[PDB]
């Protein structure tokens, strides 16, 4: 019966959660910001 | 066939009720945070 049509969906479901997962982590700004072309940053060095 | 299925909807169904008693702890957490008092940290009550 329906056992593995059940297995699917819930693969399904991990798949769509790691994508949210992902997106809630990472997709926390509603634009993208650049960093200035100096790095005049009072000696504080972020080229790393 | 049919205790297989139930057992594999009871485990199903504990495992949405983690999902749900992790969603009610943070929404307790949210309660007590930011309705019974002010929160300070930042976007746990919404962004600004
Ligand atoms: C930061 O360090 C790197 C390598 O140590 C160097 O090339 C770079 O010039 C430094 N940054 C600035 C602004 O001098």
Redesign the interface.
């Known amino acids: 019966?329906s056992?593995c049509t059940?297995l699917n969906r819930?693969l399904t479901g991990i798949a769509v959660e790691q994508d949210k997962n992902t997106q809630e982590v990472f997709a926390?700004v509603k634009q993208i910001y650049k960093t200035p072309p100096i790095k005049d940053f009072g000696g504080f060095n972020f080229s790393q | 066939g049919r205790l297989?299925?139930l057992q594999?909807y009871v485990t199903?169904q504990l495992i949405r009720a983690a999902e749900i008693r992790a969603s009610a702890n943070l929404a307790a957490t949210k309660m007590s945070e930011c309705v019974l008092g002010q929160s300070k940290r930042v976007?746990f009550c919404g962004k600004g």
Do not use: L, V
């Open positions: 019966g056992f059940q819930a926390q | 297989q299925s594999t199903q976007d």
